[PDB]
C-alpha cells in the first residue's frame, strides 16, 4: 500500500488544466483519484474524467470531479490505469479485474496512456499472470477446446460462488495459464482472429509512460 | 414471385445433402426459411433423423415449431454440414453475410462445420463484393467512437435500425454498423483491418469458407463446387 500511494500521488503531476483524463481501476489508481480530487478541491484544477468502471466513477464523483461517457467527449488526452504485468518491452497484461474490454476501448481513444504499478508488476517476459480473453457465450466451449488443443491451458473465470463470471458486455472470460509469452504479438494475432474472441488482455504498443513504486520511491520510465 | 420461387427451388434442392444421423447447422434468412420448411417435411413425413444447430433465435423458433431437434453448438462434437444464405457471393466465392443481423452466430457455426453450403437466388452472384453494405457487429459501449472512426476512414457507416427507428440489437446484444463501401477489391485486407479494431466483435466477410453454392436460375438450380 505504501508503494501504491507514493505512485498515485506522483501520477497526478501529469494532469494539466483543461484535460480530459481516462481513469482506470485498482488499488493503485484509487490513490491517484484521491490525489486528483485533492488538486481539484484545493488548487482549482479543471478537468473532465472518463472511467473504465462504475466503482471509479462513483469515487471521482464523490470528490467533485466531472465524469462523462466515452462517447460524450471527442478526445481523451491521457488515461492513467494500473496493469497486472508489464514486460521489459513495455507490453502489458490487463483484465485481472475482468474489465479488459472497456479498459482497451478507453486506452484506444486516449492520446497518451500511463500505467502506475508497484515493483512487483515489472517482469522480464509476460506470462506468469494468466492472460484473460473475453469470449462470446455461444460456442465458448468450442473456443475453450481450440485453446486446449493449441496448448494454452485455458480456464473459465468464476465468481466467488463458483458460477461463470459475466463481463460488463455479458461475455465470459477464459484465462490462459501460459507461464511465458515470448511472442505476445503473435499470440494476440492468433487470439483476435479466432471467431467468438471479442478482445484479449494483451495491451501491445499502448503504454507511453510507466511509474513504478520502488522501495526508494517512484521511478518514471518512458516506453514510446 | 419469381424470386420466392427461386429461393423455394434451392431450399428444396439443398435438403438432398441431408442424411440420417447428420448434425446440420441451420442458417438464417428468407432463403434458409424454405430449406428449414423442406427439412421439416422430410423429418415429419419421412422419419429423417438429424440434429440441428442454430445460427439465430429466429431460426431456432422456426425449427422448434416443426419438430426439428436443436442442440446447443457446444453439445455436439462436430457439425457435418451447415446450410445458410448469403447477401452476395463474388466470382471467387467470397461472401458478404449479415443482412439478417445474424453474422456472428453464422460465423461461429460455419467455423465448426466440416462443410459449408450457401443457397441463393441468381441475384446474389456478383463479380466483386461491395454493392451490398458490409455489416459489422460492434460492442455498444464506445460504439459512437467506433462509428466516427469508420466515418473518418471513409467507410460510409450507418447504424442498423429496427423498422420503428430504434437501434437493432443482435442475439448477443450488440449493435451493427453497415458500411456503404460500393466495391471491395481486397476483402482479406479489409477483414483484417476490421477485426483488429477494438470494439468490433465480428464482420460480415466470409472468406475461404463456402464449399458448395446452389444458385436458383431461370432454368433450375446450378450446383457450383467452390472449394
Ligand atoms: K474475433
Ligand atoms: K476486435
Amino acid at each position: 500500500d505504501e508503494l501504491k500511494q507514493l505512485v498515485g500521488t506522483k501520477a497526478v503531476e501529469w494532469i494539466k488544466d483543461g484535460m480530459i483524463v481516462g481513469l482506470g481501476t485498482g488499488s493503485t489508481v484509487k490513490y491517484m483519484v484521491d490525489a486528483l480530487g485533492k488538486r481539484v478541491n484545493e488548487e482549482g484544477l479543471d478537468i473532465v474524467g472518463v472511467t473504465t468502471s462504475i466503482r471509479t466513477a462513483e469515487q471521482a464523483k464523490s470528490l467533485g470531479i466531472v465524469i462523462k461517457d466515452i462517447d460524450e467527449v471527442d478526445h481523451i488526452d491521457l488515461t492513467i490505469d494500473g496493469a497486472d504485468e508489464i514486460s521489459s518491452d513495455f507490453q502489458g497484461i490487463k483484465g485481472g479485474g475482468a474489465a479488459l474490454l472497456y479498459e482497451k476501448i478507453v486506452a484506444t481513444k486516449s492520446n497518451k496512456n500511463m500505467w502506475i504499478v508497484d515493483e512487483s508488476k515489472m517482469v522480464d517476459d509476460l506470462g506468469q499472470f494468466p492472460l484473460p480473453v473475453e469470449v462470446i457465450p455461444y460456442g465458448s466451449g468450442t473456443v475453450f477446446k481450440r485453446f486446449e488443443e493449441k496448448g494454452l491451458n485455458p480456464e473459465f473465470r468464476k465468481n466467488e460462488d463458483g458460477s461463470l463470471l459475466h463481463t460488463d458486455s455479458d461475455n465470459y472470460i477464459i484465462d490462459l495459464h501460459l507461464g511465458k509469452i515470448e511472442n505476445p504479438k503473435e499470440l494476440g494475432d492468433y487470439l483476435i482472429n479466432q471467431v467468438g474472441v471479442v478482445e484479449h488482455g494483451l495491451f501491445l504498443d499502448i503504454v507511453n509512460t510507466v511509474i513504478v513504486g520502488r522501495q526508494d520511491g517512484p521511478e518514471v520510465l518512458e516506453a514510446r
Side-chain angles (χ1 to χ4, degrees), chain A:
Chain A
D1 294 340
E2 61 273 290
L3 295 178
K4 288 167 162 185
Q5 170 151 301
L6 284 187
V7 173
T9 291
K10 193 61 170 169
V12 73
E13 297 174 7
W14 280 249
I15 297 165
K16 172 160 86 153
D17 228 278
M19 271 169 47
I20 300 191
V21 185
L23 302 171
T25 52
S27 37
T28 320
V29 160
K30 193 98 181 296
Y31 289 115
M32 182 275 294
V33 172
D34 283 337
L36 179 55
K38 202 207 176 181
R39 289 193 65 197
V40 158
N41 298 134
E42 281 170 20
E43 181 198 316
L45 182 73
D46 169 79
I47 55 129
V48 163
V50 175
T51 69
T52 60
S53 89
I54 305 75
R55 153 182 292 161
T56 306
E58 295 301 314
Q59 177 198 190
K61 281 181 294 184
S62 295
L63 295 170
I65 301 159
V66 172
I67 297 297
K68 287 188 180 167
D69 187 70
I70 189 163
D71 285 339
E72 291 229 281
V73 298
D74 84 308
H75 65 106
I76 297 175
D77 290 293
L78 176 71
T79 287
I80 301 175
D81 199 352
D84 300 307
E85 278 191 340
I86 302 175
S87 69
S88 56
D89 188 42
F90 297 104
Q91 309 300 177
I93 290 168
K94 286 169 63 48
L100 55 153
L101 178 59
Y102 284 16
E103 291 172 344
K104 206 177 275 194
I105 290 174
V106 173
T108 297
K109 200 176 191 163
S110 294
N111 293 348
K112 299 293 182 192
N113 284 279
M114 171 188 324
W115 297 336
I116 55 168
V117 294
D118 71 87
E119 242 188 335
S120 75
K121 303 309 188 49
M122 318 300 138
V123 299
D124 272 317
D125 311 289
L126 296 181
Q128 289 288 112
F129 192 90
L131 172 60
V133 185
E134 183 155 346
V135 176
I136 294 292
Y138 186 64
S140 60
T142 303
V143 172
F144 183 96
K145 184 52 156 95
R146 289 183 184 113
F147 292 167
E148 197 171 24
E149 291 186 347
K150 192 134 154 114
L152 312 174
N153 298 128
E155 178 197 19
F156 276 96
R157 179 78 69 82
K158 313 276 172 57
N159 298 126
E160 202 207 279
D161 49 295
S163 46
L164 294 173
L165 181 144
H166 286 47
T167 67
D168 298 302
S169 293
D170 247 291
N171 296 131
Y172 294 149
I173 293 297
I174 294 172
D175 294 295
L176 301 183
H177 292 264
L178 297 167
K180 192 191 289 219
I181 308 169
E182 301 89 348
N183 196 345
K185 288 176 176 205
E186 196 282 329
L187 176 62
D189 194 67
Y190 167 73
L191 292 169
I192 205 71
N193 276 99
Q194 284 296 126
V195 71
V197 170
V198 175
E199 188 48 79
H200 54 69
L202 293 168
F203 275 56
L204 300 184
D205 293 352
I206 286 177
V207 67
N208 297 108
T209 307
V210 177
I211 305 182
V212 187
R214 304 204 187 277
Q215 292 302 132
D216 306 324
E219 173 176 33
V220 180
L221 298 174
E222 300 293 343
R224 36 181 93 77

